[PDB]
Paper text:
In this context, Met can be viewed as a uniquely plausible non-aromatic substitute for Phe, since the electron-withdrawing sulfur is expected to produce a partial positive charge on the γ-methylene and terminal methyl groups, either of which might act as an electrostatic surrogate to coordinate F-. Accordingly, each central Phe was mutated to Met and tested for F- transport. Remarkably, F80M results in an active flux-phenotype and displays clean single-channel recordings with near-WT conductance. We determined crystal structures of both Met mutants to test the prediction above regarding F- coordination. As with the Tyr substitute, the Met structures are virtually identical to WT, and all residues surrounding the substitutions are unmoved (Cα rmsd ~0.3 Å from WT). The Met side chains in both take on a twisted conformation, filling approximately the same space as the Phe ring in WT. As predicted, in both Met mutants F- ions are coordinated by the γ-methylenes located in nearly the same positions as the coordinating Phe ring carbons in WT, as though the substituted linear side chains attempt to mimic Phe’s aromatic ring in occupied volume and F--binding electrostatics. Also surprising is the full activity of the F80M substitution. This may be rationalized by the F--coordinating γ-methylene, whose weakly electropositive character recalls the electropositive, edge-on presentation of the Phe ring to its coordinated F- ion. The Met side-chain configuration in the F80M structure is in striking agreement with this idea, but the functional impairment of F83M, which offers a similar configuration, remains puzzling.
Fluc channels, present in all classes of life except higher animals, allow passive transit of F- ions across the membrane down their electrochemical gradient. Bacterial Fluc channels are constructed as small, dual-topology dimers; the two subunits, each of ~120 residues, span the membrane in opposite orientations to form the functional complex. These channels are notable for this unusual architecture as well as for exceptionally high F-/Cl-selectivity. A Fluc homologue from an E. coli virulence plasmid, nicknamed ‘Ec2’, was used for all experiments.
Author numbering:
A (entry chain D), D (entry chain C): 1 to 96
B (entry chain A): 2 to 126
C (entry chain B): 1 to 125
């Protein structure tokens, strides 16, 4: 019944080539968050990286100016029933 | 075969109780899942009361003793679920609660065993 | 919930039976740290660790098999309660060195086996 | 299969009114030993006292000189199957 998906994913700060994102942790033991990002225009590779379970913010760098990016965050979390599994993602669009 | 039935009947009741209590309550406080804690504390209590009670009644059927201790307490308690919970916390970088979980499970389970033993020991005259 | 109950009972009964057989066969061989109770906790730690890593890679497995292996088998096989009386008895016997040793070897050992189980499968895939 | 009864019960030292007894511990977790002693002659009352599980010697005091005593030792021990139970006794006769 308890959701393992993060909430309130948003860009807290931005430059033309980078985004500082943050999110609220779900009420489960998160081992790590997986951040993904790629250009919304679906003709460019999606990249992913992890952040530790204690962190609830991340920096994305090396972006192109004036381009729409799709950014998602999901968890690798422990629960009783599923042990280690991956949550569904929370997703936002942001234009540099 | 009679001993095997005691282990299976007791074990099945204990495992079922752990399953029900864990799925119902563990998600309420994930830093120290209370379903897994309560079953370990409860099993510690029961085995302690068994320790003291069976000493005073040496002629009880080995069936009931085996059903309560190896069966019920054995099925009800868990070291394995306790380990993954701690392992996950260690992997999550949550050392304060990994350490707290180890102390509260172990020190707590011994205290409940002591309580169970001494409550029954104090009751006898 | 009836199909889930069968997984818990079947798994639990196999685990409890294995603990019973291994404990009665081996615990008396070294009573300062009963090896039957240690081996089942170490083994359950290993299985739950391998399950942790394996079930992550196979998210579409039936919840039946996952529940039978973890809550059932590992839950029934491992024990916190029998671990507690062994330590309690040693504490009552004035044998503090082995009471402390038993606590460290069971807990540190069970976490190490969980780590081994997890990383062996993680390194394989 | 492992015996919980002590072995080699014997008087290591004596005075007219006391006996220092010793025994080999059985290969089980002994919580306490129970020492019993009474006059071998007839039905004078048998008395008992406990000694801690770590000790494998005990002093018996307040005996009468030149009298035959029956001395027994049994354990209250932990095992896997029986939890806390009492062993059979080991027994010796000794004349002060
Ligand atoms: C006394 C009991 C001993 C029993 C043995 C238990 C062994 C514990 C295994 C720990 O697992 C590691 O824990 C790190 C710390 O949580 C994680 O680092 C993660 O988090 C770090 C910061 O928290 C980052 O620096 C790393 O890059 C990142 O991988 C890492 O992934 C994980 O494999
Ligand atoms: C780790 C967290 C804490 C968990 C809870 C701790 C519970 C421990 C209970 C210990 O029980 C006592 O142990 C003493 C031995 O340790 C025994 O003393 C016996 O043995 C002593 C010598 O070993 C003598 O001095 C005493 O007179 C004699 O009663 C005593 O009877 C017994 O009740
Ligand atoms: C977290 C727990 C909180 C509750 C604690 C309350 C304790 C109340 C009981 C009194 O404490 C001990 O009781 C033992 C008996 O129960 C006595 O052992 C005596 O009797 C034992 C057997 O019953 C022997 O093993 C010992 O050698 C012998 O000293 C021992 O002297 C005494 O100090
Ligand atoms: F374990
Ligand atoms: F835990
Ligand atoms: F327990
Ligand atoms: F132990
Ligand atoms: Na168990």
């Amino acid at each position: 019944s308890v959701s393992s998906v993060p909430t309130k994913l948003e860009v807290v700060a931005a430059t033309p080539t980078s985004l500082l994102i943050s999110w609220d942790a779900p009420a489960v033991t998160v081992v790590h968050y997986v951040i993904t990002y790629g250009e919304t225009g679906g003709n460019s590779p999606v990249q992913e990286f992890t952040v530790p379970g204690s962190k609830s913010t991340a920096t994305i760098s090396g972006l192109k100016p004036g381009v729409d990016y799709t950014i998602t965050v999901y968890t690798m979390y422990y629960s009783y029933s599923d042990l280690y599994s991956y949550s569904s993602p929370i997703s936002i669009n942001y234009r540099t | 075969i009679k001993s095997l039935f005691a282990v299976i009947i007791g074990g099945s009741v204990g495992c079922t109780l752990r399953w029900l209590l864990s799925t119902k309550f563990n998600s309420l406080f994930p830093n120290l899942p209370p379903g897994t804690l309560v079953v370990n504390l409860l099993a510690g209590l029961i085995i302690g009361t068994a320790l003291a009670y069976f000493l005073r009644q040496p002629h009880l059927d080995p069936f009931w003793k085996l059903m309560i201790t190896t069966g019920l307490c054995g099925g009800l308690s868990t070291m394995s679920t306790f380990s993954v919970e701690v392992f996950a916390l260690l992997q999550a970088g949550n050392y304060i609660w990994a350490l707290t979980s180890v102390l509260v499970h172990v020190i707590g389970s011994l205290i409940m065993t002591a309580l169970g033993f001494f409550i029954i020991t104090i009751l006898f005259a």
